[PDB]
Amino acid sequence: EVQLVESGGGLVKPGGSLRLSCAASGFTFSNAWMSWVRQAPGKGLEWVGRIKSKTDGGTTDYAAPVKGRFTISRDDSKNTLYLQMNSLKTEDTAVYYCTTGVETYDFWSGYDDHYYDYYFRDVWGKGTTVTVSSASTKGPSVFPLAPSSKSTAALGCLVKDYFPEPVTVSWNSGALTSGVHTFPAVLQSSGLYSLSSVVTVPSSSLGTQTYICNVNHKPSNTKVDKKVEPK
Amino acid sequence: EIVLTQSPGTLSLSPGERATLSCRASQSVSSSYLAWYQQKPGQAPRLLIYGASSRATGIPDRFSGSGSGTDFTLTISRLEPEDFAVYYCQQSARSFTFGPGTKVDIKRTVAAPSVFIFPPSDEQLKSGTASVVCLLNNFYPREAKVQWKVDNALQSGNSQESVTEQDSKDSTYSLSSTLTLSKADYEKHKVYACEVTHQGLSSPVTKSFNRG
Incomplete structure (x- = not known):
């Protein structure tokens, strides 16, 4: 055509x-x-x-x-x-x-x-x-944004200092999809990218459900699965 | 070069309503050189209208174009769930220039944002940098103001924010702001606060924390 x-x-x-x-x-x-x-x-x-x-x-x-x-x-x-x-x-x-x-x-x-x-x-x-x-190719750093010990609860993962785009973020290998917000990446002044993926779950569920964020970076061929738990 | 401006910047309507987008030109543009394009996220621009009034082949009948030389108008008779995108007006007379773009989003009732704050993890602390996260979840409209404070000292230039696309179910937005500091600057101070100003809030809502 x-x-x-x-x-x-x-x-x-x-x-x-x-x-x-x-x-x-x-x-x-x-x-x-x-x-x-x-x-x-x-x-x-x-x-x-x-x-x-x-x-x-x-x-x-x-x-x-x-x-x-x-x-x-x-x-x-x-x-x-x-x-x-x-x-x-x-x-x-x-x-x-x-x-x-x-x-x-x-x-x-x-x-x-x-x-x-x-x-x-x-x-x-x-x-x-x-x-x-x-910048050069660099693997992402995943830091757990833990729920507040004060207290619906919110948690997530901050994917910082990676290059280049893109990066895929899932929750519980795709089992958790409701209330999930994966924000667009942001280019830092150092030339590296950083985003954050959050999820809001019931507070009681925090005591009966495990939450694991899975971050995949294709250029660096990196796969990081990190659990998110209260401090 | 002729400058093109679009009004309004954002248009909030519901499916089945009449949408009117205005394009203003700095100088008189011949009707044969003005066009209207539509772009959706992650997709190439789609020519909706050419020659101010003529309709491209395959474009639905709800898209209509009118205008003279300085003022032009793109009208959508009845909005569809697929018509919520960005719309640009382009002019080929003089030079090739685009407009700022008009975003058309789904209209809903005003929803106050849910504010959360996340301190930096100990792994990032031992790494040498500190990132404090402020999350504004499920609000409408998209306009929202985030202000970082470190021991009541207003910050500037060290925060970056990003907004998600409008939700298909909730029609609300979500914003994430990251405040980046060195480890020494993070250990110097104690209280860190995020102040949110939104239409759905009577007073700005502040969420703060202390190291420990």
Whole structure:
């Protein structure tokens, strides 16, 4: 079908460079104005840049936070888009989608004739993730957030000082799922991530039920099962 | 470059209600260059409307677009459980810019947060750092204020908070704030308090603890 597949994203040092590629399929790529659009973690959509078709002159435009460091090119013989990123920053850490934007009104003529007479569509990719930091791979540290001896009760596990994302947290090997809140990770100033997973259970249950949090980190291949009990 | 603003920042409604989102442009935008996109968590943006008023193929009929050059409007006639997401307005005239985004969340009655506080474990203490956790469980709306205090001294710059997505059953939010200190700074003081200010609370609720 019609699709855009991004590739090339990964971990880059704050001073390094990286080339993202975007393969197009299913439509006449040479006639479409292409664009790179990024989205930082927990933030909105940010337009990185745009390149026009060879017919319209191939003029390229960039956003202010990106102008002077990023370049965009296209290979019509390969139906491929390229984003060369030089002098990266931590602020450049985001998911980079390759999109077509809103093309001309009659861009999709002939597209699916059995079903449609007039057709309009934009194309987006699944996006590629670019992480820019000076940190290395580090196993997570699981600390038990124990229930209050004062006293419904709440307990949990704090997963601190790990890199990179993601980390999976379960309770009693998935047996406990009600009242469980796994919060989004937070990037510390040291370049390491930290999150916390809490669960609220009846106080009496605290005396008759064992609670074990299971933390799995794929990059470090770490599995830590820690029990949570009052102090 | 034309700047796009969206109103309101957050829209709280229930399924089956009429949703109205306004996009304001710094300068007059040609109707053929404005679009409305919808994005859901962990998913690529989905083009809802192109050309201010035209509807993309496959988009349900409840999404409608209107507007002139400075003011535009995206209207959802009747909200569905799948229509609660983030909505952006984009403009292709002049330069390619997005809007701030309007979050549409399920409306429910005001619920006060349940405040809990967790001191650092002894393992983390011997590790060399102290992290104090403050948990605000099940509240609405999402707006909430957390203030850390160390022997009545208000803190700043050493706390980081994160909020969960809206619950499917409760339609409430949960917030977790972490205050990070060194072992020496943690052993210097005694009382540590977390003060919560929320719409569902008459007075800010404070949860404190002492080492021991």
